Amino acid sequence: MKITKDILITGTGCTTDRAIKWLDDVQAAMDKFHIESPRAIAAYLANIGVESGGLVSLVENLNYSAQGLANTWPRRYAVDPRVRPYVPNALANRLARNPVAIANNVYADRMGNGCEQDGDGWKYRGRGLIQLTGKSNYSLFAEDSGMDVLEKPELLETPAGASMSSAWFFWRNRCIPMAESNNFSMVVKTINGAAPNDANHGQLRINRYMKTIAAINQ
């Protein structure tokens, strides 16, 4: 369905100026990945807006102190993950305040990435609205979209790439059937990792979902 600037603002909480810059990219992404019904469009917009702070935040933040590393990945970066506070280990103290070195270590040898030394963890760090991480998902998105994101992963920080990759994620993770069965809670769990709650702004997601259905049907 053709959406408006006002539907996009209702759905994502974005500014008027950002809605104007993103409208055509969001429409093209939803059309490409068959996000067509009021509930599918509402569930997609409600989640991409909260995940990205209103289409503002498009890349993983890897700025950490040693204490932030221990707190975020205690099994990797705390001396002992069974105690409070966590104490940063020697690895945490070496990697702290080094975004590239953190990503290369924490994302090494998973999600399709190779070894720490060869740089895939940083290269394929989280990007987009619903962030894609790791060489495997960048590769699958490249094949499904035709976007050159292995050579140019920074395309996922453009409005076109962020919208397209989020629409791909929504389609591929079966969110369209969930939306069209009125299972918004499962859509949020699938995208965020947890059902609607305080931590993931669940009430704001639900409020924007319901408000966007109403807006579209008019």
Whether residue 99 is preceded by a cis peptide bond, meaning omega within 30 degrees of 0, is no
H or E element at residue 208: helix 202-216
* Residue 186 CA neighbour count, 13 Å, CB half: 12
Q: How far is CA 166 from the centre of its chain?
A: 7
Torsion of CA 41, 47, 53, 55, to 10 degrees: -40
What residues have CB less than 8 Å from 87, skipping those under 6 apart?
A: 70, 78, 79, 80
Coil, strand or helix at 59: strand
Resolution (A): 1.4
